[PDB]
Amino acid sequence: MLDKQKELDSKVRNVKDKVMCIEHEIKSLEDLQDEYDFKCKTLQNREHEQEQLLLKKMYLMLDNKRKEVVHKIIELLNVTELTQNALINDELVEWKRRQQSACIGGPPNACLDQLQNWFTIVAESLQQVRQQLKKLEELEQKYTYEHDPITKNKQVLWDRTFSLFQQLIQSSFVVERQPCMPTHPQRPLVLKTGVQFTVKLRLLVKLQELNYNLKVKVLFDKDVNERNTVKGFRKFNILGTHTKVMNMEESTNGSLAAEFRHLQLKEQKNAGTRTNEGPLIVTEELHSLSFETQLCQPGLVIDLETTSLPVVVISNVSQLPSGWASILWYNMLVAEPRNLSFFLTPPCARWAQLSEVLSWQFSSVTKRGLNVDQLNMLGEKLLGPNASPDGLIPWTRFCKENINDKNFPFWLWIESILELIKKHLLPLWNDGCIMGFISKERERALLKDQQPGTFLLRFSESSREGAITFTWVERSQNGGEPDFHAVEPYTKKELSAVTFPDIIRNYKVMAAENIPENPLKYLYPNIDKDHAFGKYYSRPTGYIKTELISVSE
Amino acid sequence: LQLKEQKNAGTRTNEGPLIVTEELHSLSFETQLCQPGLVIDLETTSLPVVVISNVSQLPSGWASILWYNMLVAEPRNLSFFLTPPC
DNA sequence: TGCATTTACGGGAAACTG
DNA sequence: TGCATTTACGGGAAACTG
DNA sequence: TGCATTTACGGGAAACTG
DNA sequence: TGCATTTACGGGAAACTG
């Protein structure tokens, strides 16, 4: 809350008051050297037409007041140093980290407004200290003597006031909108060759002489030494328009920003790399959007620069699954140090951490996360029966290695099940009709509930296509549990044709010459079919009305 | 062959950076076979090496040199230790 | 304002190259 | 010879312009 | 060949700097 | 203010040179 905010805020007011105060001291010293100027110029030449002492004890004030002002700036400059080091190395940086998790999902970033203010104030303040150190240069260019406080301190002050300004604006040059392909907006670091993508750059020092003065250029792969070093590094060019100027218009509420839309990638086919298909790394190699500008002004020549997160470049959205996986791991295990190498030797991760992303994945697409009992099934497919919340999962196990006894990676499994929900199961899954994830052990042992006629929902473990199914229970006459029952898993193909709910309504099972049954009555604990999934049902010389229907035996 | 440090402030020896002394460095070599019509440039490089001041350190260090030489093919991953494996 | 036409992209499959 | 990646095109929907 | 003298390094502790 | 690293020096052993 206002734990550090209130601290930092008090320190910026502090700076702002200590600039005002210096300015009253400049005005009273601007007066007292004119008064002496008047009284000395009528007294030096005076015989052309009770003791007292005005010329000996008052002149002292043109020393004393110059020492008080000069010492009083240094005190301000020291204070601005501390305020600035907190602002830069704590307040921005921790907004950053926040950002890198609003990529991969989770809690949303707050605005930049609060940070802009602190920036801007600390920058107007240092602009005012610049002018006052030039009114001091002007008083020295009128009257100078033996020990002049503003001749020993003139250059050390000027040099510090700039050294501070530079550091201040250079850190103000940030990326507001991490690059993204508009059509895939929860997936914002994965580029495709020959779609358009968009970025936006934000400057924090909202000054108004910085309007139509900064033209921000976009580069690709600038100063990436993996190109030379790694074997098989692709190269690419950007294609939209690169050069924009940064304007206070467009983006409302000031915000000296630039949003470049219509950015594209194309590959530079020049053999060259020769596309070695025995190098280090596949496509999980990382790349990097770079930006760059320069604040030109009378006496002021600052070079700005900044850089996107690591980005991944693909050809086909057959890839983008895999890719995203990259972008999770990275954004999950890493501070910022553009480790473009990461994946040569990629770390492990803590099942207590991974878990919270896995949640995030579904919570981002939909309106409902992975609850506890569902993570337990997953960690256990990753770890093994001892699913400590400290166990380490290796990046292979996650993404490029077949699980226990199946022919597909563990992400590439979840990747499909998410998809299925996003296009065929939103309602049932925002309204928690699906158990989804469960082991075909603690299913049976939770169906020794009720009426020979309860059924879960499950996602199937044995597809790669992601395919939902249902499980239900009978009475076998032996005085116990049934062999239970579950059905061949219902994938997209089927669900394309008739909706999953509607499968449910009208499930059959049949015989030669026997009336057909309906073994689905009660969903989990006790809920009548025709209640849970009531509300999704579709609808309730002259053609006759047909349906589709799912049927066993 | 000897090492000496180039004290020029410069780095300013930040004692809040990434990595301690397990940073890796690298001996590089280089020559050229000149001959009538033949002008070849040769080059090669040591393993990653670790540089210390005092053999109060060399324990720690060795530890570096185990991990690296144990988990790695050759690709001079000079970064390793920013994000070192298991 | 509405309709015709063009565009941009997703997705599947074949073509490429190491 | 097989697998990894890219390219090509069809369809569908959105965008554009008269 | 043997002895004197100097050298190089290991190790501990204090000094440095962020 | 504390911790990380470097530097400084003493001792011991080896090397060097007459």
Contact call for B82 and A229, based on CB within 8 A: no
Contact call for A347 and B76, based on CB within 8 A: no
Place of tokens 């503003």: A150
Closest-CA residue of chain B to A89: B16
As a whole number of Å, the CA-based R_g of chain B is 17
What is residue A468's three-state secondary structure? strand
What is residue A228's three-state secondary structure? helix
* Cα–Cα distance for residue pair A241/A218, rounded to 1 Å: 9
C-alpha angle A489/A492/A497, rounded to 5°? 105
**Residue A483 φ then ψ, to 5°:** -65, 0
Closest CA relative to residue A284, chosen from A319, A235, A309, A318: A319
Choose, out of B68, B76, B82, B86, the residue to mutate when testing the contact with A (most A CBs < 10 Å): B82
Contact call for B83 and A339, based on CB within 8 A: yes
**Min Cα–Cα distance to chain A from B64, Å:** 15
* Cα–Cα distance for residue pair A342/B72, rounded to 1 Å: 14
What is the 8-class DSSP label of residue A172? T
CA B2 to C1' E5, in angstroms, rounded, equals 25
Q: Is A112 in contact with A2 (CB distance < 8 Å)?
A: no
Technique behind the model: cryo-EM
- Tell me the residues of B at the A interface, defined by beta carbons under 8 Å apart: 18, 71-72, 75-77, 79-80, 82-86
Strand nucleotide closest to residue A315 (CA to C1'): D6
As a whole number of Å, the CA-based R_g of chain A is 35
* Cα–Cα distance for residue pair A345/A322, rounded to 1 Å: 18
* Cα–Cα distance for residue pair A98/A128, rounded to 1 Å: 33
Closest CA relative to residue A428, chosen from A333, A517, A504, A508: A504
For the record, the structure tokens of A169 come out as 């604006």
* Cα–Cα distance for residue pair A260/A240, rounded to 1 Å: 9
CA A316 to C1' C12, in angstroms, rounded, equals 11
The enclosing H or E element of A13 equals: helix A5-43
Number of helices and strands (H, E) in chain A? 16, 15
C-beta within 7 A of nucleic chain E, residues 28-57 of B: 54-56
Distance of CA A526 to the CA centre of its chain: 43
Q: Is B62 in contact with B18 (CB distance < 8 Å)?
A: no
**Min Cα–Cα distance to chain B from A398, Å:** 15
Q: Which residues from chain B sit within 8 angstroms of residue A280, using beta carbons?
A: 75
CB neighbours of A459 closer than 8 A, spacing ≥ 6? Answer: A417, A420, A434, A436, A437, A466, A467, A468, A469
Strand D atom within 7 Å of A277 CB: yes
* Cα–Cα distance for residue pair A90/B78, rounded to 1 Å: 29
Both ends of chain B: CA-CA distance in Å?
34
Residue A40 identity (one-letter amino acid): C
C-beta within 7 A of nucleic chain C, residues 257-276 of A: 271, 274-276
What is residue A28's three-state secondary structure? helix
Q: How many CA atoms lie within 13 A of A188 on its CB side?
A: 21
Q: Is A443 in contact with A458 (CB distance < 8 Å)?
A: yes
**Min Cα–Cα distance to chain B from A345, Å:** 6
Contact call for A344 and B84, based on CB within 8 A: no
Contact call for A345 and B85, based on CB within 8 A: yes
Contact call for B83 and A347, based on CB within 8 A: yes
**Min Cα–Cα distance to chain B from A547, Å:** 57
C-alpha torsion angle, residues A222, A223, A227, A233 (rounded to 10): -30
Q: Which value in Å is the resolution of this experimental model?
A: 3.8
Q: Is A139 in contact with A150 (CB distance < 8 Å)?
A: yes
Strand D atom within 7 Å of A193 CB: yes
* Cα–Cα distance for residue pair A167/A299, rounded to 1 Å: 16
For the record, the structure tokens of A168 come out as 């201040």
What is residue B50's three-state secondary structure? strand
Q: Which residues from chain B sit within 8 angstroms of residue A339, using beta carbons?
A: 79, 82-83
Per this entry, what is the length of chain A? Answer: 553
